[PDB]
Symmetry: C3
Subunit: 295 residues, 3 copies
């Protein structure tokens, strides 16, 4: 059984085994190396791999990671301090607001909607009711801070400097007088001074022309009666007038009343009592009063 | 003599002078060499001269050769949560009310005093003031009732005279004016019969007043007390058919009793006479109110 | 024959002794049956699978990008949602009258306690307040009305009327009701007998004493104060005699002046006669009264 060449021991090998000069070696890629005389795994640097516990193992932070079914797994305890902080905000916070409350979602700012006329914010940031002036109508008015009665309604004085005219059955004449005027509540008082006139008739008219002669702030319209231009027998009274023709006057008791106001002219009736022939009349001071027009 | 190799220990084996090596999965032939086999891409790689693990350097780092999370992984999440915690609303104090389950903030208000207008604003509820006559609503404000300031009426009734056994009656038509707290009865001129030195004139307001004025509306604020109010002088023409002699008498309001107003007429002397001519006279006095 | 002879030496990790070859192995390499194997003690994420050495990871938490271990972005989805949810609408700051305490996370509101309060029901409410009123406007049985005292007050004067004229001086004790109604005062003198009078003269009412409480002297001052006026001018008939039948003269009376609590009335006109005694009619004196 003679083959020319007799192989003895080992004459060949398969990769990664190789033979050079009758010496056998093993080729090694990166990752495999020699540690002393033994084949070793090479783990350059520090990347989480290490030779420990008898072999190749992967290392990880035992607070952040764990192994479940031989799978790298996040420990749930690494998220917990996040979930409890959020959960602590979810348990109670404001997401929406109802009027008068207003939340601007984009600025995260909360404010309150109020009404200027009724409410105001003071110098302390407090919400407060605005101190409002109540709606009043003369003669009701603001009096030193409160709801009162206007002093101008209670009393007002002025003067009329003007013409008194007598008319009656052809008898004719006029005189100039200065008179105080007092307006008190809903009345006007015209305080005529004593004056001298001429012939009067049994019945006649004494007219006061308020179209001119009223001193500011009074105007003609302020002498209009509350009964306006109706014909009345208002404030009828008895006046004594001295009649004469140069000599000793005879005092006649006459009847006088406010009868009508028309277009600024107050007309007073003067009648009754006796009559005599005479050329002169000595009139007494006479106050004439009546209720005054208002608006 | 033999110097060769005749047997080998695993993982080496020999058949017919040829040696081979047995390899499990994970070890493999790469070109001529033994190599670690790493199928797919699972983070493992042969690099920098050996076996290494590969990790996103934004999320992980290595500390004492352990895989570790970068702290900067959570920086965004911790900053955001901190951005809320540092200042937010978790609770509300009345009248502010927070429902924790719906995250709704609303305000508790009193429906009688406050309200929310169409503008969605908080505004004080308008309240009409409580007013007592003669204070009243005048064209929308607190004013003085026009009716208290001036009221016109009329009396058509009997005036009667009584003095020292002289008696007689007359009918008159008189305007009445009520102005603030006074009443004025404007009697017209009238004729009568004989009068005494002193006597009483009576106005019977029980009948004759124009609706809606009533008898009680003529009651003095001094009610039925006896007074000497509004004393004045009046001239009365006394005659017996001829030319009258005018006597100056003294007249005042003396008492109202049950709708009848009494005026005293006395003084000024006396003559013998059968007829009297009375002037127009206005009678005024403070009027009753409740 | 000519023999091949073969291998006679070897390099680590192979070694030869007495015709036997062995291979030295360090930790991490081990025998698995007759094969060479990677040793992986325990479970640390490493495994032999799919043909070789692989690393294993939770596929919900990690992924492989560029062959680098990486965090799935879906790991942070539950958290990014909740945070965002709060972010899109929450209260960070409050404006007066609202006040947020950034530390206690407590929101309240600042109110003025003089005009506003919190009731029993926890509601916000305006405090009920009485309107501010000025006499003669007053609280009348619950509402805003006209004070009854201003509408009618009654009192009395018990004192001396004095006449003065052309060297004539005399005085007379009288009593009179006083009525104050709205802005007027009325003094109701009774008829009385006096003595000689002149053509013109002054009748004076001394209000310094004799007014009944709660009326005071000052209460009789006219709204025109101490101005000299011709107010309430009227006719009065006065009987003049020397003990016999009086002759009645028509005189002119009016309010002339009030001064230091004494009211003066002018009385003039209508002629005259020699006489020693005067019979005065009842006279009511009225004028607008002073107010504060
Ligand atoms: C993390 C990683 O890269 N994994 C690789 C893996 C790894 O490199 C080795 O296991 C380490 O030793 O190799 C895997 O197979 C690859 C092929 O994709 C190797 O064979 C590798 O790449 C080459 O593969 C050739 C290709 O040239 C040719 O196109 O296709 C044939 C098959 O048809 C071969 O696969 C390559 O891409 O060129 C040749 C190269 O020399 C090889 N490297 C080594 C070190 O031998 C694997 O193990 O499955 C693929 C895996 O993704
Ligand atoms: C990630 C992992 O699985 N690690 C394993 C590890 C790993 O598979 C190898 O290192 C990779 O080559 O192997 C570890 O040891 C085990 C046994 O503890 C291996 O020997 C492995 O186990 C098997 O179980 C055998 C039984 O078949 C036998 O009857 O009894 C023995 C002693 O109890 C074992 O139980 C198995 O899983 O089937 C046999 C199997 O063939 C073995 N695998 C290989 C590749 O030879 C280790 O290294 O310690 C365990 C470690 O968890």
């Amino acid at each position: 059984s003679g083959r020319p060449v007799l192989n003895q021991g080992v004459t060949s090998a398969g990769a990664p085994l190789s033979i050079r000069n009758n010496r056998m070696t093993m080729g090694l890629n990166d990752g495999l190396t020699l540690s002393g005389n033994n084949l070793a795994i090479r783990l350059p640097g520090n990347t989480g791999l290490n030779i420990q516990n008898g072999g190749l193992q992967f290392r990880f932070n035992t607070d952040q990671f764990q192994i479940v079914n031989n799978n790298l797994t996040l420990k749930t305890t690494v998220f917990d301090s996040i979930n409890s902080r959020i959960g602590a905000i979810e348990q109670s916070y404001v997401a929406s607001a109802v009027t008068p409350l207003r939340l601007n979602s984009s600025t995260k700012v909360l404010d309150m909607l109020i009404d200027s006329s009724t409410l105001e914010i003071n110098s302390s940031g407090q919400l407060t009711v605005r101190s409002t002036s109540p709606n009043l109508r003369y003669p009701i008015a603001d009096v030193s801070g409160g709801i009162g009665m206007s002093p101008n309604y209670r009393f007002r004085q002025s003067m009329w400097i003007g013409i008194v005219s007598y008319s009656g059955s052809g008898l004719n004449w006029r005189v100039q007088v200065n008179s105080d005027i007092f307006i008190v509540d809903d009345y006007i008082h015209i305080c005529l001074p004593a004056f001298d006139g001429f012939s009067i008739a049994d019945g006649g008219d004494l007219s006061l022309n308020f179209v001119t002669g009223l001193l500011p702030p009074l105007l003609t319209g302020d002498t209009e009666p509350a009964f306006h231009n109706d014909v009345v027998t208002y404030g009828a009274q008895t006046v004594a007038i001295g009649l004469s023709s140069g000599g000793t006057p005879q005092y006649m008791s006459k009847n006088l009343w406010v009868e009508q106001w028309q277009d600024g002219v107050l007309r007073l009736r003067v009648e009754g009592g006796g009559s005599i022939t005479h050329s002169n009349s000595k009139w007494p001071a006479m106050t004439v009063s009546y209720p005054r027009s208002f608006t």
